[PDB]
Point group: C4
Chain length 239, copies 4
Amino acid sequence: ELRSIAFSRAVFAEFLATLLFVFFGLGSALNWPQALPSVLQIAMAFGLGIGTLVQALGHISGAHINPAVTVACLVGCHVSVLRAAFYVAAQLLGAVAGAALLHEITPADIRGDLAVNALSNSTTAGQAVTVELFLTLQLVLCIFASTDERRGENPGTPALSIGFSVALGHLLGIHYTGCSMNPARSLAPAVVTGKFDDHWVFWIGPLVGAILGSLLYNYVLFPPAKSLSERLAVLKGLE
Amino acid sequence: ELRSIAFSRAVFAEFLATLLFVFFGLGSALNWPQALPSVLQIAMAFGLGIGTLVQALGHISGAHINPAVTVACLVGCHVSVLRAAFYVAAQLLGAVAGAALLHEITPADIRGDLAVNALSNSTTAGQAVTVELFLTLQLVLCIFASTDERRGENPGTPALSIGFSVALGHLLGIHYTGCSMNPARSLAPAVVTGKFDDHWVFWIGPLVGAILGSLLYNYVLFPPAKSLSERLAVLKGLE
Amino acid sequence: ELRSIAFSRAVFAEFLATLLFVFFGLGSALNWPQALPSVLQIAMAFGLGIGTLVQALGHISGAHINPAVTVACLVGCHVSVLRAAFYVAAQLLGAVAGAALLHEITPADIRGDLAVNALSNSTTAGQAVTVELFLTLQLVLCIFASTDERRGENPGTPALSIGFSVALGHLLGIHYTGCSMNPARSLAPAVVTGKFDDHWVFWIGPLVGAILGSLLYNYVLFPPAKSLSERLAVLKGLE
Amino acid sequence: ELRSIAFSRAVFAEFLATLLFVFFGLGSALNWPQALPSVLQIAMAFGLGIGTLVQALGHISGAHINPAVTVACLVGCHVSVLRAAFYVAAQLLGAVAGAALLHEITPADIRGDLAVNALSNSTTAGQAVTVELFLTLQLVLCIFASTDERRGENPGTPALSIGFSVALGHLLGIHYTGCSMNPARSLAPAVVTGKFDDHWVFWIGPLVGAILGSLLYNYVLFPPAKSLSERLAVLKGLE
């Protein structure tokens, strides 16, 4: 699987997707003095950023653009362990490269904290991790339903629904933590700016919520017909 | 039908859908001091919240996420009486659990009334119930058309159109009552906060509008070919 | 054709569509003192109002919801003269009934002019009619493309694209005339409020733009294969 | 190919698409004193303007509405050199005609600079061209994926995804350069108003980003099965 050319294109697609998502998402969330972005305006930038990249790079790599979604796909036996390892590595490397490019093009008077995720509105860490658990739970449920092969009778809008699911969470999670929903999106400006205050919330939150969202869909809500041998073959790099 | 495993998954899906809809909808409608949500911003949160859950949980339970829509489907002979009973029970229980989770994670200085539906802009109860009758009439008409099996030639966007229909009503109903459109969404913060002022509007309004919307579609606009025996078989738990 | 039951359902659908479009569109465009609607907020209400009704009532009557679109379909030989006569009559009657219902439910301190179309931003009548010509030209081009039977290979999003085309024009036409784009939507609050200042712009503008948009699509851009006898048969009530 | 009637309809469609895109996009981006458009409001006008015209004129000319996308399609061997020459000529002529019509209908007190692209927020030319390189890279990647014939199993939403990709870039690029993303959209008000300050950014930026976006999709991400003779036949006007 690693030696495949299509796999290398998938890792680069995940690298490029997280690079563009962090570039277009964090840049629109900056504190622009002339026109301060609204919560809906930031929500649509993060929202349509995923929806654009799912349309653009969904047929190449699946367009996870998120370690949490990659972990959720790993728990749901949708991707291999080696593919999930390379996708997370590509997502984390692409995010930092996306935030470093944004930090290099934005004026110094405007970057500030580069839109790091921080506990806002006097929200404690206990409440913050609970929001991120539910913010990514609806994203993973919407992603698994949109990318479900059992629903081929109604293709629907896989790109927009997944994209609008990110916008839905940002209309809520901005008021608490800036709506992380993505460990790569949180680590991208934290590495550049050195602001790692309460950074465990944006990692434990989205990952646990994605695991619970994946276990709900694949084992409780809509269980597939895959056997134990079939699930182990997908995980351990067998075609 | 009750003994079926797929039915139990449908009741849990309706429980989880109303839990997430109240969580993501009421939370974005709170009076955040730093960034007060606009009418469009609240509309898209309630709007894309339904659209996300219809994509996520439409193939499992139908994604009613509303007693009014469940009643409308019951009048239109789309669901059984026992399924409608369990869906409303799951919707009301999920909504209160969704509002209690939101009340426990939001700062005390920010919860306030937890975005209860109230008569705003000096609107009387008589005018308020008339808006909710039309707010849910367009939702039920859009839901029945999006989920119509006779329109298989053009699947369209069942998730987005239903979701955007909720956003359409919220661009109007926020100025009158906060745009209930859902007895579960109205009862969710009313139970927690104890604010039950003019609560009959948010129950009589959406239910009558959903009944009229269901009778318009199934008996006036687009009548199906189901006989009297077929309609009674669907209602009284017969497969 | 008149004696057909499906035709009577189409006239009532056009009556109900324009009733709901005027109800949900004009109400969200009112001058609410606590939360004055933005240009985008009014655009999405008029925008998603058409998109909801096209999804809801497109398979019943075509969901013109506009005399201009009905005239455009009449020029393009898509509907009969008798169907276009009854659709415009249903649209004009539904619009006034929709605006009268909105005027009866809105507080007196809030109705004001009930969001009548008026020349705003010191725009003269000459410039105003030129905008409405282009506002409805893009709507008719998007409607004819979305409802084209030759494009069955790609159904796309007929409901959302038509709906978002109305939102596109409202992001421009609000600053000039309140973005009429619909003689029924303009006549609805003008009749109730008695404000008929420069009302010819909102009739000559959208009608000429729809005729030019229909002649562009059906005779210049994408001409069909219909003969002269086929076009006359569709117009003069022949099946 | 030039003698074909369908080709002449494609050039007029590209002329009309860029005329309407500049008309509806620049007009909504003007400095209206009563209601100054937000960054999201301008983003949706430019965003839904492309999405409407892709739905309306995608089946006639491909709905490039952009020299950069036309160049990207030329590099990707999707259109001929003669078709790309005529599309750019139609796009540039339509844009100036679209901006001249908007300048003639807008009040003198409101036109101002007619929403020319300018370096805003103290952004230098070096940083500005880097944003436009990435703004058009995501547009070209989304356009090529939406119009890919290999993805016929999932048609998706070609009109909305391409349209929302333009809205995604405008949520970011407005704060830097007004989000050109289109040499025709930049040259349209620059010619009328005579404001050509740093105009090379809005030409070098989108063109290089479209070339890189086209080379990424067609040679790195999702290479097709076209041979060297097949690519040369498409480019040099051979059917």
